[PDB]
Amino acid sequence: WGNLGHETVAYIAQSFVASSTESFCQNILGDDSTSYLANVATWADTYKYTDAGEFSKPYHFIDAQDNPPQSCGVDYDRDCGSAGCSISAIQNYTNILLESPNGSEALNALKFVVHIIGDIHQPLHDENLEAGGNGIDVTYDGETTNLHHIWDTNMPEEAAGGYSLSVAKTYADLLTERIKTGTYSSKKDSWTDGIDIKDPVSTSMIWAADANTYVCSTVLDDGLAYINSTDLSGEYYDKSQPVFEELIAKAGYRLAAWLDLIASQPS
Ligand SMILES: Nc1ncnc2c1ncn2[C@@H]1O[C@H](COP(=O)(O)O)[C@@H](O)[C@H]1O
Ligand SMILES: *[C@@H]1O[C@H](CO)[C@@H](O)[C@H](O)[C@H]1NC(C)=O
Ligand SMILES: *[C@@H]1O[C@H](CO)[C@@H](O)[C@H](O)[C@H]1NC(C)=O
Ligand SMILES: [Ca+2]
Ligand SMILES: [Ca+2]
Ligand SMILES: [Ca+2]
Ligand code: NA
Ligand code: NA
Ligand SMILES: [Zn+2]
Ligand SMILES: [Zn+2]
Ligand SMILES: [Zn+2]
């Protein structure tokens, strides 16, 4: 996701973490503001464009080598790669926070977890094709862009009504209510099925696999003829909105559950 997406996920997590988890995190981050997670949710995206952080570029995604929209699937051993991926990163950085939450590495580890759990839920971050669709040019609201970009940025920002931190906060509130009492409230207790602090690879693979199903059902199900030749701000946006909104919600809720486990469970 772009910035609004990451901040939204983070504000959602803030609304579900236990009070003791909130403490734990605030302490690591040196920030007790009401935006403590949201304030760090985009950091990894800066860092990957620096010399020092170049190594972390692969940690944003897992390039699933499947055949959408006919066949979707992710496989850790097949798809992670020699430089690492989102899944291996969640393993590493979770372990750092489990075993060395007061070491020098904890602060970045936590910032990475916050960001990467968000990225795992962007379906095109779990797809190899055309570099997660970056190489697929599209039209959106009369302008040329690419498919990855409209998922990261144009569509969620249109849905939210903007792109700043304050807009992220309002969008997070909308989606948080959907989890607590609204249209996601009867499904959300299944969203944490299979979660296991002692098997970060399995756990993050569940999430990556879940998001990847939407590559087939939603992102590319219209086919490339339609994707290449229509303005995707019409019916395509209408079809995609309930999916990206649910996935952002899942990311925030799963992030909260994960942080709660980090702040409380043994290795
Ligand atoms: N699923 C993805 N989501 C976002 N960026 C990606 C994805 N897959 C590859 N990329 C980026 O696209 C570029 C080329 O990808 P590759 O040919 O897999 O090395 C690299 O800079 C990758 O970081
Ligand atoms: C684990 O984290 C350290 C600290 O950022 C990093 O330098 C190392 O490359 C990481 N390894 C993996 C496999 O994520
Ligand atoms: C759609 O465009 C992509 C490149 O952006 C190309 O790979 C693909 O073959 C095109 N498909 C059709 C049916 O035009
Ligand atoms: Ca942006
Ligand atoms: Ca139910
Ligand atoms: Ca359950
Ligand atoms: Na790759
Ligand atoms: Na611990
Ligand atoms: Zn992102
Ligand atoms: Zn992206
Ligand atoms: Zn990212």
Author numbering: 21 to 287
Any passages from the paper?
S1 nuclease from Aspergillus oryzae (EC 3.1.30.1; NCBI sequence ID: XP_001818636; S1–P1 nuclease family in Pfam, PF02265) is an extracellular, single–strand–specific, sugar non–specific, Zn2+–dependent, fungal nuclease with 3'–mononucleotidase activity with a pH optimum in range 4.0–4.3. S1 nuclease has the phospholipase C/P1 nuclease–like fold stabilized by two disulfide bridges. A cluster of three zinc ions coordinates the substrate/product scissile phosphate and the reaction mechanism utilizes water activated by Zn2+ ions as a nucleophile.
Each of the two protein chains in the asymmetric unit binds one phosphate and one molecule of adenosine 5'–monophosphate (5’AMP) in the same binding mode. Phosphate is present inside the zinc cluster, 5’AMP occupies the NBS1 site in an inverted orientation with respect to the standard substrate/product binding (the ribose moiety is far from the zinc cluster). Another oxygen atom binds asymmetrically between Zn1 and Zn3 replacing W2. The phosphate moiety of 5’AMP interacts not with the zinc cluster but instead with Asp83Oδ2 of NBS1 through a sodium ion. The adenine base binds inside NBS1 in a position almost exactly above and parallel to the side chain of Phe81. Hydrogen bonding to Asp83 is realized through the Hoogsteen face of adenine.
